[PDB]
């Protein structure tokens, strides 16, 4: 393949973060969240996959 941000991309709109701890009777709960999209290929035909190797 050709490494070029105009051909394929991965998006991370929101990075990893930790929310403030929510307390209970004698213990706490700490939630975490993040965002992602995956792999997107704007321009195909610039990638060749040789299978059965």
């Amino acid at each position: 393949y050709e490494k070029n941000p105009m051909n394929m991309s991965i998006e991370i709109p929101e990075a990893f973060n930790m929310l403030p701890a929510q307390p209970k009777d004698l213990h706490f709960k700490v939630p975490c969240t993040s965002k992602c999209t995956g792999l997107t290929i704007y321009r195909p035909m610039t990638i060749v996959l040789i299978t059965g190797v």
């Binding site: 209970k24 009777d25 004698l26 213990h27």
Partner: protein, 53 residues
């Protein structure tokens, strides 16, 4: 000898015609627990009154 044997107070206005006092009470308990607990015994209160002339 009444006024010299029993105490005399002046916490009453000349226009007052009845009086009242209050009394309180409480209940409760405790137990032996662990780190991760979600139940704990509770307490409460109470009250009562009396009158005069």
């Amino acid at each position: 000898s009444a006024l010299r044997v029993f105490p005399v107070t002046t916490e009453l206005s000349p226009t007052d015609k009845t009086f009242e006092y209050m009394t309180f009470d409480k209940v409760g308990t405790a137990q032996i627990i662990a780190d991760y607990t979600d139940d704990l015994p509770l307490v409460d209160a109470l009250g009562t009154s009396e009158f005069g002339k």
